[PDB]
């Protein structure tokens, strides 16, 4: 989950 909302970055 961290990941998927993480490549906003
Ligand atoms: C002990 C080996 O555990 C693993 O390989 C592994 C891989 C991915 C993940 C994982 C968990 C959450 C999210 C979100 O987004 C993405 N990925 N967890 C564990
Ligand atoms: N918001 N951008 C990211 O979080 C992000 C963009 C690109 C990459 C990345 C990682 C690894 C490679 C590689 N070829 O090993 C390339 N681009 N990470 C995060």
Given at each position: ?9
């Amino acid at each position: 989950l961290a990941a998927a909302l993480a490549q906003a970055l």
